[PDB]
């Protein structure tokens with residue numbers, strides 16, 4: 001058995017891989033591995049931690065990612081869809097990934113990616129203005145955010161208050177010098193964690209991403225809003 005289920009459902013090893021929702025096709029040139037046994041066949045896609053902060057976090061030993069089969073995911077800052085494609089593999093056909101990205105150039109890549117993946121909804125919009133797209137987004141189980149803005153906690157909190165179920169979870173990427181380049185990484189991460197707590201986004205774990213990225217954190221937690 002050459003590829004084993006990782007601890008996280010929907011992830012596998014052998015080197016992280018996910019199960020390819022679109023057998024035969026690569027998204028960004030990644031290695032694909034197909035295994036056949038009699039009539040049976042299954043393909044996996046390599047998941048590069050130098051291109052995907054979520055992969056870096058999984059190889060770094062994150063306890064929970066909450067992105068799992070059947071999950072509904074709001075992905076803020078989807079860029080051209082590199083990580084989104086693996087999220088799509090993980091949540092599978094009964095899951096959903098809204099890919100919010102404000103660049104029209106990257107949006108074109110996301111639209112091309114979603115032609116083959118029925119579980120991706122490209123939302124080509126500024127995540128600071130969720131009122132512009134709130135009629136497209138059903139309540140989600142998880143928010144993944146990589147918007148890399150000084151005000152990203154406020155941005156993520158606003159989307160959470162609008163779209164994230166009570167008891168749902170969040171996975172937030174924090175690049176310290178995109179939030180405040182004159183502060184130390186520790187000061188940025190502490191300040192962001194503090195701000196998250198004040199929005200009822202309760203961190204349950206936080207880790208950095210060395211050796212894949214410098215001064216880059218991932219914070220995972222649970223959203224527990226008031227009545």
Ligand SMILES: FC(F)(F)c1cc(NC2CCNCC2)ncn1
Nearest residue numbers: 077100101102125126127128147
């Ligand atoms: F800043 C924002 F308004 F929240 C936002 C950002 C965003 N995309 C990121 C993706 C990572 N690089 C920087 C742009 N797509 C939509 N909204």
